[PDB]
Symmetry: C5
Subunit: 223 residues, 5 copies
Amino acid sequence: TEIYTSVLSYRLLEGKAYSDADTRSLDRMMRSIDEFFSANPGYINFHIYRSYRTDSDVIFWYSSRNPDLMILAKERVQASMRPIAVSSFSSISIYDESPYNAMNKKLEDSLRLPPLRYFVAYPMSKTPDWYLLDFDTRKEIMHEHIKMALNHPDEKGIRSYTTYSFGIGDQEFVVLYEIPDIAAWSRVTEKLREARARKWIIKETPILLGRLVDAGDIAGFLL
Amino acid sequence: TEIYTSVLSYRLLEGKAYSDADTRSLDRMMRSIDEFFSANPGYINFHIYRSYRTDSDVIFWYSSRNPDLMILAKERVQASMRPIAVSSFSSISIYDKKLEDSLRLPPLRYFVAYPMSKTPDWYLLDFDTRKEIMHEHIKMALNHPDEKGIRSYTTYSFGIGDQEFVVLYEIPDIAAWSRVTEKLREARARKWIIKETPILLGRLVDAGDIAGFLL
Amino acid sequence: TEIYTSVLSYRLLEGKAYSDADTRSLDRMMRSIDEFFSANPGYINFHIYRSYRTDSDVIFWYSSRNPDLMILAKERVQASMRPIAVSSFSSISIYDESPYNAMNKKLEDSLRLPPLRYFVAYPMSKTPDWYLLDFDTRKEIMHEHIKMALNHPDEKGIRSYTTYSFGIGDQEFVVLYEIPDIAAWSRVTEKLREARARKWIIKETPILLGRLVDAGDIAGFLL
Amino acid sequence: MTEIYTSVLSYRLLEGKAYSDADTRSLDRMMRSIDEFFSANPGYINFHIYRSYRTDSDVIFWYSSRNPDLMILAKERVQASMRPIAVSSFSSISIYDESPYNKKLEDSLRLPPLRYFVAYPMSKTPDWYLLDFDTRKEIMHEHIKMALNHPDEKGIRSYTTYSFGIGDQEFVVLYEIPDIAAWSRVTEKLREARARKWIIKETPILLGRLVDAGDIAGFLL
Amino acid sequence: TEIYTSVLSYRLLEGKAYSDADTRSLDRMMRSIDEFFSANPGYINFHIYRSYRTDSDVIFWYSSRNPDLMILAKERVQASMRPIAVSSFSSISIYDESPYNAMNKKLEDSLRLPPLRYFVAYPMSKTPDWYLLDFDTRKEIMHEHIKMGIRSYTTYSFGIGDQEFVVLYEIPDIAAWSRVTEKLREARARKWIIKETPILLGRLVDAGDIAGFLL
């Protein structure tokens, strides 16, 4: 029943000049990755992003209820990327659907919508003291944050996903956002620095910022 | 009487395309490592895992009472892997239904390894106090509806590695284990626990199947 | 409305002697990058710097209102550098225009002034406690800081830009400075260690220090 | 009677190349040649080679001399021999604290080495040095007594060395040990000493298995 | 009239067997770097050092009042080193001439003295809390430390590097120096001192001799 997700980033190896043949080879490879995901109904979503950071050229995001499909997908992407690139980040985590369920929405339905132009992903953790607080006081601290986010004008049109990775990765959470406007998102985040929740929040690096790209267009953008 | 254990992870080197002959060579090499371990009953266990993390392609886990076998194993695996791969992690530690019998059971589908340490203040607490704290934590785990079927081994590495403990888990269900872990954040024991890196998550694989998965 | 900015740094790969041909190639490539930025009026500024740090050989700094131009610029620079170099830093952030508005002046005008000889950039963040202080408390603390800078004997000629990157990079701010004199700036910074503001400031690494260079002159300096 | 310096260096064979039998013979010749280099100069008090339990090293070297010129010459020789095939994963230079032996520490260094070796850097918090000398003395005496009284301390040879101002750590502590698990149990017990409150930065911990120069190529390749 | 200084360290690339041709080439290149510095009186000093640390083979130290000569020197060294080596550290900082001015001496005169056998450099910073102490309190604490052969240089790099200070020493004896540093751990000043890494320790070498030592 639970939905797993991964975010992977890769950087093309330096020290090599790329021929036209190399460009075409990259294009065929990205199209093939895209076809791998489209061919299996078990993949709920798969999107590719160009990267604003120089430590990555491409970011991949995909989701499935099947943990076997999750490892197969990682190996597929890795096998395709390794002759020309190295991974700069990976995460595996599980969507928390409760914010969607609370609003009579299905998280999966959101994942099936055509993606927004930008994507933000980062790991996040909280200090040990956070979990040692009463469920009630944590609820209050979190309500303030949620209320504050909901009330921001620049919040309009953002799709937010909280995912958990306790016991299975180097962070407790991986938080994912589909966003229409980089500056607007930054302003929302800046306002949310005003929430008490911040006092317990740590380790939000790397923050990945991506620009949606079709598989057939990426080689042309990169090379 | 002590039983040692090691977890090693490796990443295949980038920048090279693998031919069909390279794929066969990898298959032979992986099967050769597997048979290295099976040929010596001194190795209580040996398992290979596919890696969820992109910083590794394979994880190895093996155990022996014989510290000589532990260094021979590390050298064997490294000698086999170095032409095509680099290690991304290693640990050597000592384990804390006999544990040996448990290690001989058929392995579960998933595996988690991670280093961990505790704050200096922890060890300065009374043994009875620490025992009580550790028992609440065990009890909290045992009572969680998602804990069913998880096997855990706490191993120690004081003075012999870069963490104080390496805790190893065989788990049937990744999401279930993550939920148990989340609940355990509420245990008193967590106050003194220093998360260390990396947390490794693996999918059990037969040596004969790994070249097909990787390449 | 918002103006975006990026600072990128690259290190030439080691282990190869550069021929005369390789020198010509680097000169041509740098000239071509520069023509890329000059040809598009959508790029408000673009400057190249030689690097005092050994972990870089070149620093690029450019600005645009257009985030599409920003991702295209990053991809263009990365595609040009990757056969011979690896990136050692990148940032994407948004100018804060209010300090300029407070002195009745436009930030864009300033970005159009002839560049000064030296350049400093670094990331910076603040402790969670900072954002939880009242808005008027932060104004008082920041006033002390800004005034202390303005009255320093060594402050002459310095142009500073505070840029923000909440939710879009690994730091909260990227602070950029054009300076006429390195030691003068260092003395100003040393005095500002006495400002109350320092209590809440963290993570000022890496600090990049650059010497202004024209695209057609850098090959000569690097090789 | 002047100070005795020591260095621990570790190296990892470069990945991405298959080693031929000729490569194996070359490594054997090189290791034997390094061992001869240390043996030929009586200024080197000891020199031992260790196989490494960690994957980030294949070999660990330990050597000592009163002559700091011989120390840098040793590091340069080892690096020159290793660099065509390996990268260094750790190095240290430090000076033995002879007070616990004061027996002669040099006599201990000249004994045949034990089967295992542990080395690691260590530092203390700034606050430690600011404590009254009596308080530091009382804390160190507690630690030493707790170590002396542990059954598993049997037959371990310990060396504390200092590197204030000359390296990235304050101390490099070195142990010759007969048994890995016994050492780990001693170390575990010693977490109960108050000394621990001020100790930081004990990474990497290097754990080695003694090896003859003529046997290492066979073990590694 | 400030004086800038840089410390650069480099490590020869591994994976290459150096021929005799390569040794001669290294020798020519080192002598050529030395000739570059000697030929320009704008450089107040320039010295090369062998390194105790395996992460460096060579350390360079030079000084100039002219910041455009400083970037020229770094690029010159980097251009020569690039085909065979990678830099493991660099700093750029400015001498604090006040201790020399307090004793009515000139820092520059001291930089022109024949160098001592050993060189120590490391970055250092202080906690924020330090600078916010009353000017009075700071001067008192510093007087205990200052009061508590060796040639010392404090250099500052506020706002221009990853550390606040780079402290440089020419020393005649390593062990004696380690003992001085241990004693100074007792100075009140240490409360607020952080981040002294890497500590580089160098042995003075002539340009003409370095190739023979390294290869």
